[PDB]
């Protein structure tokens, strides 16, 4: 795929964001259907849980500066008020923003 890295996701349990403990990966499958597929696949069972259709400006991938860890990222949808939280499972932060940048590029193009 275009972009594929290890990152955990979070689920909105009721009214509280609860991070997942499973070792999953985030991959962007840009198909010829012009649908930027942003999907989350678990490396444990190899099951794809999340699979959305990202389009320019609609889905704004950004990092949360209000986090001490700094590995928390969020896919803020300008429509539907949807927000998906993810946390980089990368050992070093030398490629944290780099991954995000590549993601944003593919999501908007």
């Amino acid at each position: 795929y275009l972009v594929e890295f290890r990152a955990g996701k979070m689920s909105l349990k009721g009214t509280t964001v609860t991070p997942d403990k499973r070792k999953g990966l985030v991959y962007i499958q840009q198909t010829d259907d012009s649908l930027i597929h942003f999907c989350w696949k678990d490396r444990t069972s190899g099951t794809v849980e999340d699979d959305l259709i990202i389009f320019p400006d609609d889905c704004e991938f950004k990092r949360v500066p209000q986090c001490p860890s700094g590995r928390v990222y969020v896919l803020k949808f300008k429509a539907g008020s949807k927000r998906l939280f993810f946390w980089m499972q990368e050992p070093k932060t030398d490629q944290d923003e780099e991954h995000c940048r590549k993601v944003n590029e593919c999501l908007n193009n």
Partner: protein, 76 residues
Amino acid sequence: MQIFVKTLTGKTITLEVEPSDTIENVKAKIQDKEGIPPDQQRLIFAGKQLEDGRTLSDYNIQKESTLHLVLRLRGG
């Protein structure tokens, strides 16, 4: 109600619609203002493309919501 449809150019097109209005009609309205064929019009809302056989209420599109219109440029 009024909605804000942002195109690829970042243009925020304010369109007059109702919750009971079908997406296909929205495309027709945009074709009146812009003139772009609805067949190449792709409306997105919350990482999901809007189907022509659906209404604004189906996607829970409230008043002053931000819609997205992306033109499929397959030829290049």
